[PDB]
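Progress note, project year one: complex with NRZ.
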Amino acid sequence: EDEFLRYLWRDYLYPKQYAWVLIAAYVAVFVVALVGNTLVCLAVWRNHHMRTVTNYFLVNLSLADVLATAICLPASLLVDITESWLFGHALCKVIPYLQAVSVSVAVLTLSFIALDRWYAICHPLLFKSTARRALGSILGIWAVSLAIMVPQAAVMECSSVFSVCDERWADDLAPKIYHSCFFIVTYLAPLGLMAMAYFQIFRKLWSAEVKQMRARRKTAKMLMVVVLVFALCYLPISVLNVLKRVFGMFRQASDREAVYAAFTFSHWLVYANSAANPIIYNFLSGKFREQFKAAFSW
Ligand SMILES: CCCCCCCC/C=C\CCCCCCCC(=O)O[C@H](COC(=O)CCCCCCCCCCCCCCC)COP(=O)(O)OC[C@@H](O)CO
Ligand SMILES: COc1ccc(S(=O)(=O)N2CCC[C@H]2C(=O)Nc2cc(C)cc(C)c2)cc1
Ligand SMILES: CCCCCCCCS[C@@H]1O[C@H](CO)[C@@H](O)[C@H](O)[C@H]1O
Ligand SMILES: CCCCCCCCS[C@@H]1O[C@H](CO)[C@@H](O)[C@H](O)[C@H]1O
Ligand SMILES: CCCCCCCCS[C@@H]1O[C@H](CO)[C@@H](O)[C@H](O)[C@H]1O
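Model obtained:
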């Protein structure tokens, strides 16, 4: 008698509740990431004491996050709902390209933040870190990120079956080599180097010198948290694409709905990172929190 009651859940209640959780998480992250990263930029613009090398890199990180949130997030939500591509051939190349560029700008900015902190803290006076040179490095980050993701744009193809956007690979081996390289370069190597750098920064940082020590320890604490949430937020999708592209996993159709759910949550986590960073600055930086509240109360 309760077969009908269970089927109503299986066929209507659950599907509606799951589409609802999906759209609500994607929308909340959209709003929070857009507003918070814009506030990061406006805060750095308003408070001159915040115009440090690190904060310039953090505004660039917020700029990359705003790019991915404004353009890629709505499209990623539509793909995760319908498992189909509704934006045409050109956008099938452009949107994935901007997603890869956003990831590359983000990880290089964190790398250069860790490099600046490592030279400033661990081997001092060797290299000068000025805001104009930091701005030069920022332009170089965009130049590299835009150049090295061109192959990513090149492999995208939009083909019908109701269109579907996916990578078109000429050989069995090329996707494995490319995604091995992509994983090692945009995730594992920069984050491992940053972890050893921040480990050394932590060991070296832990009487008038103490005033400097009080400010630098707080920012370093904040920066390590930024790196950690990044490594955590990007870990699942990065691992999943490797298992899919290098190891050939997730091709059985008996569990197609479970794989869609896992990839959808991992996509959502990438965007959740853009929402998460401004909250991190608000709770680990007193200057940022004050500027956000000066903006917040208006
Ligand atoms: C795509 C490229 C983009 C690059 C973008 C640039 C990003 C750059 C960011 C920061 C650079 C900072 C580098 C800091 C490196 C610090 C490395 C280091 O010393 O760490 C050790 C711990 O691990 C060790 O033993 C050595 C651990 C070895 C095992 C590592 C496994 C690989 C994981 C990771 C793979 C990365 C490899 C990249 C190679 C090019 C020891 O600590 P400790 O205080 O005792 O030292 C005292 C000692 O220096 C006395 O001689
Ligand atoms: C290491 O961390 C990562 C993080 C993300 C990826 S990715 O899978 O997102 N990516 C690979 C090809 C390029 C990019 C991709 O397909 N974008 C994308 C695809 C669709 C259909 C829709 C949207 C909005 C973006 C890979 C590694
Ligand atoms: C954690 C797992 C997440 C899976 C998400 C699946 C969302 C849609 S449920 C779907 O509803 C249909 C209604 O017609 C039924 O016919 C199917 O049997 C059932 O699968
Ligand atoms: C393509 C132009 C991009 C503009 C970004 C500027 C990058 C730094 S220029 C550099 O600034 C240093 C500041 O300390 C001076 O010491 C040097 O003499 C001068 O060469
Ligand atoms: C011994 C092996 C020799 C292989 C020679 C052919 C190499 C083809 S690369 C090919 O270029 C395309 C350009 O569009 C991409 O779309 C594909 O994904 C990619 O695979």
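The first helix runs from residue 3 to 46.
The longest strand covers residues 156-160.
No further modelling is planned for this target in the current period.
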